């Protein structure tokens, strides 16, 4: 699961091997630049302290004219110029070193990740169909996104900051042992707890978001399950139970979040307590050593400061090890993909290529099974020999594998037994790509790339001019719809052929295959949705180009099969019947039976959502008022310690003031712990119950909505669970964290500036000039430490959706062998974010080094002006130290706090969208009782002139004014083509869509005036695909009846009536057996039977069936239908199915054609007048 670190950096140039070495040398040199500034700070404060001690003695005596005072402070004013030169030198060196190290590591990352990305896509276009069938399609795309982002975050910049932190730690210890070791051993005795506190501080500062998603992991399943099955759920009326289950999950999630917030804030409070207790110990022992007359004050400042910076930087080194371990663990998979090579190399030019390509097909003893399900053997040997120009058709029921034979032809796989050959030699020694280009194949359901149609028809082969394009499309007879639409070669077809119709799509797909000019043509169901005349002209064109080529046609319509060369028949995988038309006529087999039968708006109204919980906000604002003013208190106490140690006094007065301030540090630590814990707890509680109540109300206002609001292209299931998962937790940052951060920063900086203006005026004005660049020096470094920006990966994947539409449409391009064109398209689509990445890699280094140098230059300028002010006697050294300490440390605290907060602008926009969802009222209300409530009914339905257009497809009408008359107990079958408005009449009944025109009378009562929930209560259906919920089977069937005490005798009675009682009573924990998502554990016929049992508990007066025997056994269809036939009396029953067994015994039968009712009446009347329903009956009987 992990790679070694030697193999991790293997795709690198000499230039990146130089970039990494120079960017770690400059990282060490930049890392050794803070303790070297502590040396200068110690020696400068020692100069200031020694001049000051000397000064008092001269003062009482007086009478010394001017030179004596001059010379005493002129030595100070002269020596501070040399120390300002030292500071400026360290500042310039740190500027150059930090720019070089950041820029060179980010350039090494950019070049390496570009080569990784190109090699991974080039390897994934060598990987067979079988690997796609075993692994995934969507997890592959998230593997690309996640693994590239994790490599870029792993070897990107964190390897530089790790070496910088190691250099800072080692330089700090070397300085702390070379100045004074007796203090460094005390702080080294402390320093494990210091490093542990810093490590856990950076740890819980790093993640900050994963606990919310692992708390919502248990509740989002119910969300995605209900939003996936929205129409069936509001068709049953089970809003209330799923609402209560969502509540039961959210209470647990909120309680674990409460525990998380309390524990994290206690941890950071204990971190602050340990920092200030380390100050109290360090300065108590330091002033013991100074008043002993053994150290100076500058020696104590240098050793302690140098030691503490080293310990916290080696603590802050901790996230880089985690990021690098994650990069190794994410790199192993991409290295596994780019390592392994298949047996069938689709780019090896060591394949063999024929020249005299003559059409001849040889199959002998061909056994093959799918590697997805290898336990089942579909094929048990097929032997064929097809000559040139021989139109071979294959007939049989669905399940024998005509599509299997087509996929076996193009070498998408290999047969486990035997040997296949094309014109003498076998496929197993000759080239795959040259063979793949010469076999033009149309599959069953083609896919069309969403480019212009000229490029689509160009996609067969490289150099095709428009004259061959026009000849091919006129052969395809697909020029009329080209002529009527604008942009006749410039029309961008939408996603998956949604812009055009199906017949135009299949005709231009035939064109797209014919532009290759192939040697063998293979059609698979080429006229599924096509009409009469266009299939006729397509088949005439197919016979126009069949004389030089070998052809195999698979189709259901026998109009295009009767004019073929050889007809054959599959049975159990084995080709059983052979010969021409009349040979199978006199053979009297299954084909004889077949032919015998056939003849923004929110502006701080986000506080309105949380006006109810005022006391949490009151104690939070109070604790932020206190906890903002703990940097100026630290400025006061630190400045007063050094102001004690500049002037002369008694030894006992110095010891008293030193002990008092080394106690005031510890008092500040305890107050910091208490107020920080209390603020963090109360803002955690307010934000958490805001997230809980807003998730509840957003879920309920989602569930009140119409079906037609859920079919919107902007309102998808993924977008709604994003608006419930990601954006519900983003509304706490617009109010609670915003008030905490604004109040904390005001009491951090305003009182520091006011104290500074009272004590020293001129220096406060100069520092107010230089202050915003130090604040930006806080925020930019804190943004670099923990996730600066993630828009570049979004731009990357938005340009790289070519990869997604290449992987999703892999089934066409493995036939077209057009891999190299897609690889070069990806290589030329990566090129612009490459330049954007290099531009960002220079600009970020420039601005980071500008702020990092402006810190040291602020030190130099502030202390030179303070030296002048002390020398001309307008303030003291205690006051310049107070002004500088308060303003600069307040600015860095403002940066470090205001970078920790989440953003406010996107939080405000997300709150505006959540308020948009909350405020909206649907056109119908499921909770209202108003309408027509009659006490009685009969059960007669009358449709008249009903037209319906889909709201997502307003230009395409699926209905053209149907009408229907249903009476009591009338088994009404609805037969038609796939996609002619079969479930549309169900959706018109169940109050999903209300039609724009038409009239529907339910027993002389119009449905538009009735109660909405009453119609949804009385009837009960079975879905087109059975969906169950994440519980047991007792709660699967128990969902059928709601607002009612569900009796278990009805449960076992319905399980016996649906003949699912056996499969339930066989299972261990029989009525408590936990079923996963959508019934993925148990089989399809069993969940179809439990869907029958779930509809059966409703006892509906109106019953609808939509494909009641899609996947079900022949003995199970009778035991399903016996309960139906004993219970079809009393209730109106309407069954829609493709199997004719429930259609023969039906009462009245209605055939549809493009939405229009063609034939209606009794079954014998439709069997008398031979129309289209006779051809529907003529399928497989006899």
């Amino acid at each position, epitope marked *: 699961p992990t790679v070694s670190v030697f193999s991790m950096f293997r795709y690198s140039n000499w230039l990146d091997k130089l970039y990494m070495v120079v960017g770690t040398l400059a990282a060490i040199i930049h890392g050794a630049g803070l303790p070297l500034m502590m040396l200068v700070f110690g020696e400068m404060t020692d100069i200031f302290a020694n001049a000051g001690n000397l000064e008092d003695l001269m003062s009482n005596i007086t009478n010394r004219s001017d030179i004596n005072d001059t010379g005493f402070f002129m030595n100070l004013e002269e020596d501070m110029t040399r120390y300002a030169y030292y500071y400026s030198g360290i500042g310039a060196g740190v500027l150059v070193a930090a720019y070089i190290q950041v820029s060179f590591w980010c350039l090494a990352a950019g070049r390496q990740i570009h080569k990784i990305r190109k090699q991974f896509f080039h390897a994934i276009m060598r990987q067979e169909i079988g690997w796609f069938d075993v692994h995934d399609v969507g997890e592959l795309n998230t593997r690309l996104t996640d693994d590239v982002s994790k490599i870029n975050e792993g070897i990107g910049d964190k390897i530089g900051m790790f070496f910088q932190s190691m250099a800072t730690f080692f330089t700090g210890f070397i300085v702390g042992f070379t100045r004074g070791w007796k203090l460094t051993l005390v702080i080294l005795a402390i320093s494990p707890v210091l490093g542990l506190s810093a490590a856990v501080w950076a740890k819980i500062l790093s993640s900050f978001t994963d606990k919310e998603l692992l708390a919502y992991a248990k509740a989002g399943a119910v969300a995605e399950e209900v939003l996936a099955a929205i129409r069936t759920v509001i068709a049953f009326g089970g809003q209330k139970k799923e609402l209560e289950r969502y509540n039961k999950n959210l209470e647990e999630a909120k309680r674990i979040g409460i525990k998380k917030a309390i524990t994290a804030n206690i941890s950071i409070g204990a971190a602050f307590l340990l920092i200030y207790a380390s100050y109290a110990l360090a300065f108590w022992y330091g002033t013991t050593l100074v*008043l002993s007359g053994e150290y100076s004050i500058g020696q104590v400042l240098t050793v302690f400061f140098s030691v503490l910076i080293g310990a916290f930087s080696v603590g802050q080194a901790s996230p880089s090890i985690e990021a690098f371990a994650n990069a190794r663990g994410a790199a192993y998979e991409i290295f596994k993909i780019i390592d392994n090579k298949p047996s069938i190399d689709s780019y090896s030019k060591s394949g063999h290529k024929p020249d005299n390509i003559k059409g001849n097909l040889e199959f002998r003893n061909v056994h093959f099974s799918y590697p997805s399900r290898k336990e089942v053997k579909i094929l048990k040997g097929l032997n064929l020999k097809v000559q040139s120009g021989q139109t071979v058709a294959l007939v049989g029921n669905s399940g024998c594998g005509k599509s299997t034979t087509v996929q076996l032809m193009q070498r998408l796989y290999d047969p486990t037994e035997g040997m296949v050959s094309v014109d003498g030699q076998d496929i197993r020694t000759i080239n795959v790509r040259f063979l793949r280009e010469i076999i033009g194949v149309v599959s069953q359901e083609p896919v069309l790339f969403a480019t212009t149609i000229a490029e689509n028809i160009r996609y067969g082969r490289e150099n095709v001019t428009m004259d061959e394009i026009e000849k091919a499309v006129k052969e395809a007879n697909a020029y009329d719809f080209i002529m009527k639409l604008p942009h006749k070669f410039d029309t961008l077809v939408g996603e998956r052929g949604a812009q055009l119709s199906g017949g135009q799509k299949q005709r231009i797909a035939i064109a797209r295959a014919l532009v290759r000019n192939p040697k063998i043509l293979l059609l698979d169901e080429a006229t599924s949705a096509l009409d009469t005349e266009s299939e006729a002209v397509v088949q005439v064109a197919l016979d126009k180009a069949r004389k030089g080529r070998t052809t195999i046609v698979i189709a259901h319509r026998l109009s295009t099969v009767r004019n073929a060369d050889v007809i054959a028949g599959f049975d159990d995988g084995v080709i059983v019947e052979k010969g021409n038309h009349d040979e199978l006529m006199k053979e009297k087999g299954i084909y004889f039976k077949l032919v015998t039968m056939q003849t923004p708006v929110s502006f701080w109204r986000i506080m309105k959502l949380n006006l109810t919980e005022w006391p949490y906000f009151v104690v939070g604002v109070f604790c932020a008022i206190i906890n903002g003013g703990l940097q100026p208190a630290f400025a006061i106490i630190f400045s007063k310690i050094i102001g004690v140690f500049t002037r002369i006094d008694d030894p006992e007065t*110095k010891r008293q003031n030193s002990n008092l301030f080394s106690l005031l540090f510890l008092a500040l630590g305890i107050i910091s712990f208490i107020t920080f814990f209390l603020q963090g707890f109360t803002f955690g509680k307010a934000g958490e119950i805001l997230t809980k109540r807003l998730r509840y109300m957003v879920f309920r206002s989602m569930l009140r909505q119409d079906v037609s609001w859920f079919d919107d292209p902007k309102n998808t299931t993924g977008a709604l669970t994003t608006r419930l998962a990601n954006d519900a937790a983003q509304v706490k940052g617009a109010i609670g964290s915003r008030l905490a951060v604004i109040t904390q920063n005001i009491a951090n900086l305003g009182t520091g500036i006011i104290i500074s203006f009272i004590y020293g005026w001129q220096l406060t004005l100069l520092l107010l000039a230089i202050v915003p660049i130090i604040a930006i020096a806080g925020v930019v470094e804190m943004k670099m430490l923990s996730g600066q920006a993630l828009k570049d990966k979004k731009e990357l994947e938005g340009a790289g959706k070519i990869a997604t539409e290449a992987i999703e449409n892999f089934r066409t391009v493995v036939s077209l062998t057009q891999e190299q064109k897609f690889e070069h398209m990806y290589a030329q689509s990566l090129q612009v974010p490459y330049r954007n990445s290099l531009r960002k890699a220079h600009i970020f280094g420039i601005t980071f080094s500008f702020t990092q140098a402006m810190m040291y230059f602020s030190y130099a300028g502030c202390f030179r002006f303070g030296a002048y002010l002390v020398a001309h006697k307008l303030m003291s050294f205690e006051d310049v130290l107070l002004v500088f300490s308060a303003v600069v440390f307040g600015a860095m605290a403002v940066g470090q706090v205001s970078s920790f907060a989440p953003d406010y602008a996107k939080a405000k926009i997300s709150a505006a969208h959540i308020i948009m969802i909350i405020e909206k009222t649907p056109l119908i209300d499921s909770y209202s009782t108003e309408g027509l409530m009659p006490n009685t009914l009969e059960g007669n339905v009358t449709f008249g002139e009903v037209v319906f257009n889909y709201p997502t497809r307003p230009d395409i009408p699926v209905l053209q004014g149907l009408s229907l008359e249903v009476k009591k107990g009338q088994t009404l079958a609805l037969v038609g083509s796939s996609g002619c408005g079969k479930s549309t009449v169900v959706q018109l009944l169940e109050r999903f869509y209300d039609p724009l025109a038409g009239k529907v009378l339910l027993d002389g009562k119009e449905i538009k005036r009735l109660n909405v929930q009453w119609l949804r209560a009385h009837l009960g259906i079975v879905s087109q695909e059975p969906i169950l919920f994440d519980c047991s089977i007792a709660e699967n069937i128990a969902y059928g009846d709601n607002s009612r005490v569900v009796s278990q005798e009805e449960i076992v009675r319905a399980a016996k009536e649906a003949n699912i009682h056996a499969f339930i009573e066989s299972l261990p924990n029989k009525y408590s057996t936990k079923v996963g998502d959508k019934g993925t554990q148990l089989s399809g016929g069993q969940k179809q039977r439990i869907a029958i049992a779930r509809a059966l508990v409703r006892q509906p007066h109106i019953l609808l069936l939509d494909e009641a025997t899609s996947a079900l056994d022949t003995e199970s269809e009778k035991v399903v239908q016996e309960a139906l036939d004993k219970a079809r009396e009393g209730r109106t029953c309407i069954v829609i199915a493709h199997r004719l067994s429930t259609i023969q015994n039906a009462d009245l039968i209605v055939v549809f054609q493009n939405g229009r009712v063609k034939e209606h009446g009794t079954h014998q009347q439709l069997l008398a007048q031979k129309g289209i329903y006779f051809s529907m009956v003529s399928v497989q009987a006899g």
Partner: antibody
Amino acid sequence: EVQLQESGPELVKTGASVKISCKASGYSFSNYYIHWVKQSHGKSLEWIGFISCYNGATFYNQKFKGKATFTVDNSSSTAYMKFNSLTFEDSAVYYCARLPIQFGNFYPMDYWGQGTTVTVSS
Amino acid sequence: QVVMTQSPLSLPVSLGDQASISCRSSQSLLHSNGNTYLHWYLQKPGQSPKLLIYKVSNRFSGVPDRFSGSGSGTDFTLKISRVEAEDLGVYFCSQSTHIPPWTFGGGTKLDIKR
């Protein structure tokens, strides 16, 4: 162990120039002042001046300004006093004593040298 | 300039009893604090002047428990109780708390009292 020790006796000529040296050993040399005081034969001690012993800022009594000069040496950690233009009145015994720079003037001169003895003759 | 005036210039103590030396200022040696600074040194013949008492009541470290200072204002006293054969040599009294004349005292020898 804190020990300031000085040079041996001198036997200079009148009008010459002499240099006497207080070498400090056993403590951190860079904090404490060095005060040079003078005892004649059978009189009270008299304070000559002090040298700051960190950077080298001197301060002399008004009787002795110009006829004495203090230097320091941080490498070997000594303090030198140079007399120029000796007369007979400058024949005495000279002592060096330290005094801490943090709480200066509120602390006694706690450690004293053994004192050199300068004998001006002609 | 203040001038200390150490009142005996000889003090014929015996061997094994009490002796008292008395420093006496010319100005009130009370600082603006509550403290009074005058320090008492012993000087042996030919060796370095050790320190005995500082800030008249207190005591240095290493000096035995016989010596004790007292007095205030402008009248200060050192007292040796049970004088041994080791405490012979002059005793002088620094300082002025008004510096930089930084004055000193005369001295007081001790005898054997024949």
